[model samples]
Target: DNLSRHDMLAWINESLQLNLTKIEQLCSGAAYCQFMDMLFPGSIALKKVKFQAKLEHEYIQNFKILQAGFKRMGVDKIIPVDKLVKGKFQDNFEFVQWFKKFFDANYDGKDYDPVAARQGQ
Candidate 1:
């Protein structure tokens, strides 16, 4: 797939149903963690992940959840925390793009019910 901001949003918007406008908004890291849950079951605690991350502190927790899930899932990719947390467009786009690459390869095309999968949160 092409590496355009529109391209990333096209996939992620429908995939997560977040209906987001800018990729930089995902700097919160919660969306990435949700994608992780969709891939590997029982890896992340959805109850703790929040989409409306106004404070930078909330973003760090989400990123921490991502690290925990990645470690448990045997993912070796290094997440650029310092660069990503600043909420810059370039860093967020690159990270989201990398995640899409990871997701496309790992996703088994299973019947993923996001609502059911994230219940009791």
Candidate 2:
């Protein structure tokens, strides 16, 4: 038994109707957009009511590009900055300074213990 154009049309219509309903639902409750944007920033893909209200484009883009490049190179895992400087405090400081330089010329910052640094302690 072969399906006809009517079958295709029905399938498409049902899909479109379900999508429209979903869109309407999303329009009503839109706070999730801000939450996602904070974690992913503006460069990453997301659809929501907010528009550039809160974002960190530089940080998100940098990490995403590094991850993508690592995946492309078949690294099989992400090499976090902490991992790269796991046992080298001096080198970690140097790398942090370098990263800060990309933001500002006179960036003089150092990496403290990872747990404390992340916890802002």
Candidate 3:
């Protein structure tokens, strides 16, 4: 028989709200994603998932730095947010709008060229 009438079970809840600052300070880049994937498994979804990478204009270089760090750390599986979107849907409009806002708030005034990205080639 159990001594206590109530049973206690451990329940763990986790979430990550990352911005440029958090990305630069905490995880860094592809390595960050790798580490996260290691810890959380499929939690880091690069394609068509709820949780995704957030891109900012000014943070592009910073993101690249993070990616380099990930490579240095031996992490090699990550998908950029742009590539995640293969096509469009009705609900995708909202995501695009939100991403646009995020870009507006974070991206530098300079035009962004994906071809120039670290992994563009």
Tens-digit lDDT track for model 3 on 16-104?
Answer: 22222221222123333333343434444322222233444322443454345445546553535343232223322333333234323
Q: 22-114, model 2: which lDDT tens digit per residue?
A: 211222111222222323344223332322222334333334544554354343444343333232334433433332233243223532231
Q: In model 3, where do residues sit more than 4 Å from their true spots?
A: 1-88, 110-112, 118-121
What are the models' TM-scores?
A: 0.91, 0.23, 0.25
lDDT of each: 0.84, 0.31, 0.32
Output the number of the TM-score-best candidate.
1
* lDDT comparing candidate 3 with the true structure: 0.32
Q: Give lDDT for model 2.
A: 0.31
Query: Could you give candidate 1's per-residue lDDT for residues 10-57 as a string of tens digits?
Result: 888788777778888888887898899999978987788876788889
Worst 10 residues of 1 by lDDT: 112-121
Better of 2 and 3 by lDDT: 3
Candidate 1 collision pairs: none
Better structure of 2 and 3 per TM-score: 3
Candidate 1 global CA lDDT score: 0.84
How well does candidate 1 score on lDDT at residue 59? 92
